[PDB]
Design an enzyme around this catalytic site. Sequence first.
Site, PDB file in Angstrom:
ATOM      1  N   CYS A 166       1.766  -2.534  -1.623  1.00 36.30           N
ATOM      2  CA  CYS A 166       2.601  -2.014  -2.715  1.00 36.30           C
ATOM      3  C   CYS A 166       1.783  -1.685  -3.974  1.00 36.30           C
ATOM      4  O   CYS A 166       1.120  -2.561  -4.542  1.00 36.30           O
ATOM      5  CB  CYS A 166       3.734  -2.998  -3.057  1.00 36.30           C
ATOM      6  SG  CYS A 166       4.909  -2.404  -4.331  1.00 36.30           S
ATOM      7  N   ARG A 217       3.005  -3.198  -8.032  1.00 39.86           N
ATOM      8  CA  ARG A 217       3.045  -4.635  -8.314  1.00 39.86           C
ATOM      9  C   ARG A 217       2.794  -5.052  -9.768  1.00 39.86           C
ATOM     10  O   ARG A 217       2.869  -6.240 -10.086  1.00 39.86           O
ATOM     11  CB  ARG A 217       2.112  -5.402  -7.374  1.00 39.86           C
ATOM     12  CG  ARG A 217       2.642  -5.553  -5.968  1.00 39.86           C
ATOM     13  CD  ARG A 217       1.624  -6.273  -5.078  1.00 39.86           C
ATOM     14  NE  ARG A 217       0.486  -5.435  -4.667  1.00 39.86           N
ATOM     15  CZ  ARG A 217      -0.657  -5.935  -4.202  1.00 39.86           C
ATOM     16  NH1 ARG A 217      -0.789  -7.251  -4.100  1.00 39.86           N
ATOM     17  NH2 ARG A 217      -1.660  -5.138  -3.831  1.00 39.86           N
ATOM     18  N   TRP A 243      11.309   1.981  -7.553  1.00 36.44           N
ATOM     19  CA  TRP A 243      11.496   3.391  -7.800  1.00 36.44           C
ATOM     20  C   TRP A 243      10.375   4.161  -7.110  1.00 36.44           C
ATOM     21  O   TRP A 243       9.329   3.595  -6.774  1.00 36.44           O
ATOM     22  CB  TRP A 243      11.597   3.692  -9.310  1.00 36.44           C
ATOM     23  CG  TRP A 243      10.464   3.151 -10.150  1.00 36.44           C
ATOM     24  CD1 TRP A 243       9.199   3.665 -10.258  1.00 36.44           C
ATOM     25  CD2 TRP A 243      10.510   2.017 -11.027  1.00 36.44           C
ATOM     26  NE1 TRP A 243       8.451   2.914 -11.147  1.00 36.44           N
ATOM     27  CE2 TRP A 243       9.232   1.892 -11.624  1.00 36.44           C
ATOM     28  CE3 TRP A 243      11.507   1.092 -11.362  1.00 36.44           C
ATOM     29  CZ2 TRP A 243       8.928   0.874 -12.540  1.00 36.44           C
ATOM     30  CZ3 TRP A 243      11.204   0.080 -12.263  1.00 36.44           C
ATOM     31  CH2 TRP A 243       9.925  -0.016 -12.849  1.00 36.44           C
ATOM     32  N   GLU A 289       5.203   9.904  -2.418  1.00 37.91           N
ATOM     33  CA  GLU A 289       5.995   9.443  -1.269  1.00 37.91           C
ATOM     34  C   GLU A 289       6.967  10.551  -0.855  1.00 37.91           C
ATOM     35  O   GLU A 289       7.146  10.841   0.340  1.00 37.91           O
ATOM     36  CB  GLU A 289       6.812   8.173  -1.608  1.00 37.91           C
ATOM     37  CG  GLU A 289       6.024   6.849  -1.850  1.00 37.91           C
ATOM     38  CD  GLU A 289       6.932   5.668  -2.350  1.00 37.91           C
ATOM     39  OE1 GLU A 289       7.581   4.982  -1.517  1.00 37.91           O
ATOM     40  OE2 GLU A 289       7.002   5.412  -3.581  1.00 37.91           O
TER      41      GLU A 289
HETATM   42  C1  HEM Z   1       9.066  -0.890  -9.041  1.00 32.57           C
HETATM   43  C2  HEM Z   1       8.390   0.167  -8.569  1.00 32.57           C
HETATM   44  C3  HEM Z   1       7.701   0.177  -7.184  1.00 32.57           C
HETATM   45  C4  HEM Z   1       6.814   1.104  -6.815  1.00 32.57           C
HETATM   46  C5  HEM Z   1       6.325   2.267  -7.709  1.00 32.57           C
HETATM   47  C6  HEM Z   1       6.372   0.819  -5.462  1.00 32.57           C
HETATM   48  C7  HEM Z   1       5.442   1.540  -4.739  1.00 32.57           C
HETATM   49  C8  HEM Z   1       5.141   1.366  -3.403  1.00 32.57           C
HETATM   50  C9  HEM Z   1       4.516   2.316  -2.514  1.00 32.57           C
HETATM   51  C10 HEM Z   1       4.041   3.737  -2.890  1.00 32.57           C
HETATM   52  C11 HEM Z   1       4.394   1.743  -1.314  1.00 32.57           C
HETATM   53  C12 HEM Z   1       3.807   2.394  -0.039  1.00 32.57           C
HETATM   54  C13 HEM Z   1       5.045   2.724   0.798  1.00 32.57           C
HETATM   55  C14 HEM Z   1       4.766   3.733   1.881  1.00 32.57           C
HETATM   56  O1  HEM Z   1       4.062   4.745   1.600  1.00 32.57           O
HETATM   57  O2  HEM Z   1       5.270   3.524   3.029  1.00 32.57           O
HETATM   58  C15 HEM Z   1       4.951   0.414  -1.392  1.00 32.57           C
HETATM   59  C16 HEM Z   1       5.039  -0.501  -0.367  1.00 32.57           C
HETATM   60  C17 HEM Z   1       5.635  -1.743  -0.441  1.00 32.57           C
HETATM   61  N1  HEM Z   1       6.360  -2.270  -1.513  1.00 32.57           N
HETATM   62 FE1  HEM Z   1       6.678  -1.346  -3.315  1.00 32.57          FE
HETATM   63  N2  HEM Z   1       7.045  -0.313  -5.035  1.00 32.57           N
HETATM   64  C18 HEM Z   1       7.877  -0.743  -6.065  1.00 32.57           C
HETATM   65  C19 HEM Z   1       8.723  -1.837  -6.003  1.00 32.57           C
HETATM   66  C20 HEM Z   1       8.726  -2.808  -5.025  1.00 32.57           C
HETATM   67  C21 HEM Z   1       9.575  -3.985  -4.971  1.00 32.57           C
HETATM   68  C22 HEM Z   1      10.667  -4.327  -6.002  1.00 32.57           C
HETATM   69  C23 HEM Z   1       9.262  -4.670  -3.863  1.00 32.57           C
HETATM   70  C24 HEM Z   1       9.844  -6.001  -3.338  1.00 32.57           C
HETATM   71  C25 HEM Z   1      10.441  -6.904  -4.125  1.00 32.57           C
HETATM   72  C26 HEM Z   1       8.178  -3.973  -3.210  1.00 32.57           C
HETATM   73  C27 HEM Z   1       7.553  -4.365  -2.044  1.00 32.57           C
HETATM   74  C28 HEM Z   1       6.805  -3.556  -1.219  1.00 32.57           C
HETATM   75  C29 HEM Z   1       6.382  -3.924   0.115  1.00 32.57           C
HETATM   76  C30 HEM Z   1       6.665  -5.247   0.867  1.00 32.57           C
HETATM   77  C31 HEM Z   1       5.595  -2.721   0.628  1.00 32.57           C
HETATM   78  C32 HEM Z   1       4.940  -2.542   2.010  1.00 32.57           C
HETATM   79  C33 HEM Z   1       5.947  -1.712   2.808  1.00 32.57           C
HETATM   80  C34 HEM Z   1       5.494  -1.529   4.238  1.00 32.57           C
HETATM   81  O3  HEM Z   1       4.486  -2.180   4.647  1.00 32.57           O
HETATM   82  O4  HEM Z   1       6.155  -0.727   4.960  1.00 32.57           O
HETATM   83  N3  HEM Z   1       7.891  -2.841  -3.933  1.00 32.57           N
HETATM   84  N4  HEM Z   1       5.390   0.218  -2.683  1.00 32.57           N
HETATM   85 CL1  LIG Z   2       7.681   4.397  11.835  1.00 30.32          CL
HETATM   86  C1  LIG Z   2       7.088   2.931  10.976  1.00 30.32           C
HETATM   87  C2  LIG Z   2       6.867   1.765  11.702  1.00 30.32           C
HETATM   88  C3  LIG Z   2       6.412   0.623  11.055  1.00 30.32           C
HETATM   89  C4  LIG Z   2       6.169   0.643   9.684  1.00 30.32           C
HETATM   90  C5  LIG Z   2       6.391   1.802   8.949  1.00 30.32           C
HETATM   91  C6  LIG Z   2       6.121   1.795   7.458  1.00 30.32           C
HETATM   92  C7  LIG Z   2       6.990   2.836   6.762  1.00 30.32           C
HETATM   93  C8  LIG Z   2       7.884   2.197   5.709  1.00 30.32           C
HETATM   94  N1  LIG Z   2       7.052   1.654   4.624  1.00 30.32           N
HETATM   95  C9  LIG Z   2       7.837   1.549   3.377  1.00 30.32           C
HETATM   96  C10 LIG Z   2       8.428   2.910   3.047  1.00 30.32           C
HETATM   97  C11 LIG Z   2       9.307   2.789   1.828  1.00 30.32           C
HETATM   98  C12 LIG Z   2      10.463   3.545   1.751  1.00 30.32           C
HETATM   99  C13 LIG Z   2      11.283   3.430   0.634  1.00 30.32           C
HETATM  100  N2  LIG Z   2      10.944   2.594  -0.346  1.00 30.32           N
HETATM  101  C14 LIG Z   2       9.805   1.863  -0.253  1.00 30.32           C
HETATM  102  N3  LIG Z   2       9.495   1.023  -1.249  1.00 30.32           N
HETATM  103  C15 LIG Z   2      10.374   0.680  -2.192  1.00 30.32           C
HETATM  104  C16 LIG Z   2       9.679  -0.186  -3.012  1.00 30.32           C
HETATM  105  N4  LIG Z   2       8.437  -0.287  -2.476  1.00 30.32           N
HETATM  106  C17 LIG Z   2       8.295   0.463  -1.360  1.00 30.32           C
HETATM  107  N5  LIG Z   2       8.991   1.946   0.826  1.00 30.32           N
HETATM  108  C18 LIG Z   2       6.849   2.948   9.598  1.00 30.32           C
END
Ligand code: HEM
Ligand SMILES: Clc1cccc(CCCNCCc2ccnc(-n3ccnc3)n2)c1
EC number: 1.14.13.39
Lengths: 405, 404
Positions: free
Chosen positions: B108, B111, B280, B285
């Site tokens: 993420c 953070r 947000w 993305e």
């Molecule tokens: C507040 C603004 C936030 C921004 C700008 C942001 C941004 C991002 C971005 C760009 C990714 C990569 C997602 C992708 O390309 O698939 C990501 C992943 C992730 N975010 Fe955030 N995020 C935000 C809030 C949060 C919050 C509130 C949480 C949880 C409480 C969170 C938890 C995670 C987790 C667990 C991942 C890994 C997702 C995965 O492995 O599929 N994020 N974040």
């Molecule tokens: Cl096809 C597949 C199989 C296993 C993992 C995967 C990762 C993709 C989703 N990863 C998070 C994408 C996503 C979407 C909307 N919002 C957030 N998000 C919101 C706050 N932080 C992240 N993240 C794809």
Amino acid sequence: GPKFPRVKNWELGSITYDTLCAQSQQDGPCTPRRCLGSLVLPRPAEQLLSQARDFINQYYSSIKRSGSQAHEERLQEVEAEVASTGTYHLRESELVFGAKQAWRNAPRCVGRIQWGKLQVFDARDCSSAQEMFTYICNHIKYATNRGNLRSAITVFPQRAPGRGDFRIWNSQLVRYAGYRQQDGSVRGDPANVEITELCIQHGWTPGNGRFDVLPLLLQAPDEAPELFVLPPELVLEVPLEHPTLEWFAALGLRWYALPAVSNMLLEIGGLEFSAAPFSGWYMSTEIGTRNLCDPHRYNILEDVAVCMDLDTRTTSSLWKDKAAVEINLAVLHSFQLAKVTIVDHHAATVSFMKHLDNEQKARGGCPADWAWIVPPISGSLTPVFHQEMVNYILSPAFRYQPDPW
Amino acid sequence: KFPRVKNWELGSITYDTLCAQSQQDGPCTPRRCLGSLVLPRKPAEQLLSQARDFINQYYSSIKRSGSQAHEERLQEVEAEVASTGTYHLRESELVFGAKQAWRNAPRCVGRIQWGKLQVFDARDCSSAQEMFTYICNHIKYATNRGNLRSAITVFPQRAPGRGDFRIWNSQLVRYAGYRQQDGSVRGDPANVEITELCIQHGWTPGNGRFDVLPLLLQAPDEAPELFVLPPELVLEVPLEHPTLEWFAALGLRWYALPAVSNMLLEIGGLEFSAAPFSGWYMSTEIGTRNLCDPHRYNILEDVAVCMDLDTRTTSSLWKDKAAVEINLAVLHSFQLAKVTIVDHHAATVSFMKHLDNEQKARGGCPADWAWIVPPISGSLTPVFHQEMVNYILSPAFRYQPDPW
Ligand code: HEM
Ligand SMILES: Clc1cccc(CCCNCCc2ccnc(-n3ccnc3)n2)c1
Ligand code: HEM
Ligand SMILES: Clc1cccc(CCCNCCc2ccnc(-n3ccnc3)n2)c1
Ligand SMILES: C[C@H](O)[C@H](O)[C@H]1CNc2nc(N)[nH]c(=O)c2N1
Ligand SMILES: C[C@H](O)[C@H](O)[C@H]1CNc2nc(N)[nH]c(=O)c2N1
Ligand SMILES: [Zn+2]
């Protein structure tokens, strides 16, 4: 099912398993507790013999004579040579196979579709710095070929016990000077401030331009490095212009044709070649994005954006992304105009995907460093972004080595 | 011993000591690095030690380590696990655990915000109906008429021998993907399977490119139930371009709220199989992955032709040029619609500040370079030139299998 890393392409949904990694004999930096895969540089006759045996086995397999009389004879010949001298020597065709396999094995190189077509120059007879210069000039002429670039490597004599190393002090055969200024800024390439000062200490009369070609500092065994200026006619350069932005040419930017790495160590069967410069041709993002736009390099992004009249006061205008694009286009357009081999990051990554499929069939895998293979702009726009990759160290190998000073 | 971490733009060096607190193995071994892989390949004493560790983290967080309140809470947990094989978190512990899991999430980039997180306790949920009510409130709170606020809603934890509470959708808001007869896909190809599941469970499908999917919600050991989100809850932004007047005519749009709904939240040994969270969007993305990925909406060529670019050859960089204008359209349109969004330059800059904060606070920060570095203009951002160490800390968000 299988007990090997499962590798997925997320664009195509296809799955492979890497069985090649099982051939790895040397550990990388990662452990189960943490991944250090993003770090650029992570930290006895018995040992030599096992590496020598492994390589000779590799060589005989490649010529389909594994287990043969000549295979077992070569093994015996090498062990006995190590027995009496502590080292051994490669036959010419072994050197060629090994240089090619080293390239093939290089996880960070996107150009490996070309690996079988590499001119290997044997310079293991070299005995002086003057002679090193001759070989290097020959390499540059052959590899540049008036713009129709050809992959090549020149191999100088191996590390010898007791005796001192052959070393090329420069990181590339062609590099621009970096002159530290009174105000603390740098004229030229900041990447090259140290080698520039070394050249001056060793008697080079320095220029004062942004693009002065550095002389070579060449070190023959147990001797001070000698200084050699490359004759300008040997160094092909390309003035940079833009296909539609007519002012771009007035920036006076330019780059050299030949990307030739000169400070890496080529290891084959435990033998170490401390001087073995190799050259390919550029992928355009190396020049357009890294050399010209890195903040710690030429750093021309803001300059180009101001000329394009972009709003450089806000990130959300994407002015950096816009300028970077036009600069890359300029590099591509100028090289094509000048008829100098170059490959854009789309065609390079497409060819690397083809390479991955070849090696899957030929070897059961291909070691690859995702962070380095994926281009520095337009990442997810290229197919390699969506391709999982396994990274590991195979030998023969190219390896970093400490600077000789 | 401890990794040496260098920033190659600034020449500065840190050492990660935080990684020594990792108790979970990642995919790498000395023989091969598997860092680019998206997914993992695959009792009482164990639970109790994860629990004490977490309770210790919590009391340390409120500067009350060693207090009798700390000592007493450790005994409640021990007594409960010893009698029942499990235990329950106090709400304050849950609030802290959720914030820490976000903090520890290596992928993420958002953070910097980790301490500002609204946590809804939904552990008193007993039916799909109730999950739907909670989800609707989450969406209303989080959306806030475009002034987005980070939030997480936490549904009942997993329990031995009974099925999980699950949201079947991967995100709270997703556009449908309809497989056409000729093998192409109308809508979002990423969601063909979830779309088909919804239809099979009684949903009447639309036929647009941007049809908002209903939610499939599952209470334990029951068939999932279908719920349509009230259209007034789902804020959307029509996409236009500041200078390319034709761009609006593409009919493109995207939703305001990025909310992950299929990840598992693990705290102190307890697992929460439904704990949707939202922040947000970072613009890339939407602009780069969602709209330009070849296996998503794949609009690159369309946009390039409108721009009358030479599509015949790679060396005209038509793809790169089109992608830039699409990301610009996303930023302009969200800003015009007054919806919170962060560009990738602003995002990565704030992430560097976060790395610095975390170095001082904890001696390191787990980060996944491949995910933190934006999908366009990588080396144009500071994170590109920053070495990073990746490892698993708990509390953590984890992937989990599809419930079907
Ligand atoms: C507040 C603004 C936030 C921004 C700008 C942001 C941004 C991002 C971005 C760009 C990714 C990569 C997602 C992708 O390309 O698939 C990501 C992943 C992730 N975010 Fe955030 N995020 C935000 C809030 C949060 C919050 C509130 C949480 C949880 C409480 C969170 C938890 C995670 C987790 C667990 C991942 C890994 C997702 C995965 O492995 O599929 N994020 N974040
Ligand atoms: Cl096809 C597949 C199989 C296993 C993992 C995967 C990762 C993709 C989703 N990863 C998070 C994408 C996503 C979407 C909307 N919002 C957030 N998000 C919101 C706050 N932080 C992240 N993240 C794809
Ligand atoms: C033929 C055209 C070639 C192309 C297009 C190409 C492309 C590239 C690129 C883009 C990189 C990344 C370098 C960086 O970003 O610093 C690289 C690295 C590398 N290449 Fe090539 N290459 C070519 C030929 C060769 C040859 C002939 C060799 C050796 C025989 C070679 C060996 C290597 C090695 C060892 C690296 C890693 C260097 C490092 O880690 O700093 N390449 N290549
Ligand atoms: Cl300062 C620092 C410390 C460790 C690694 C680093 C990477 C720079 C060298 N990487 C190769 C760059 C380069 C230049 C010209 N040509 C090639 N090249 C030629 C054929 N294939 C690649 N490669 C920098
Ligand atoms: C910190 C990070 O590893 C570093 O900036 C790397 C990333 N990927 C790279 N990729 C290539 N091709 N060349 C590089 O120099 C780098 N640098
Ligand atoms: C194979 C590769 O790891 C995969 O495509 C990753 C690369 N980096 C990413 N980075 C982000 N932010 N999101 C992603 O889905 C991915 N995908
Ligand atoms: Zn790794």
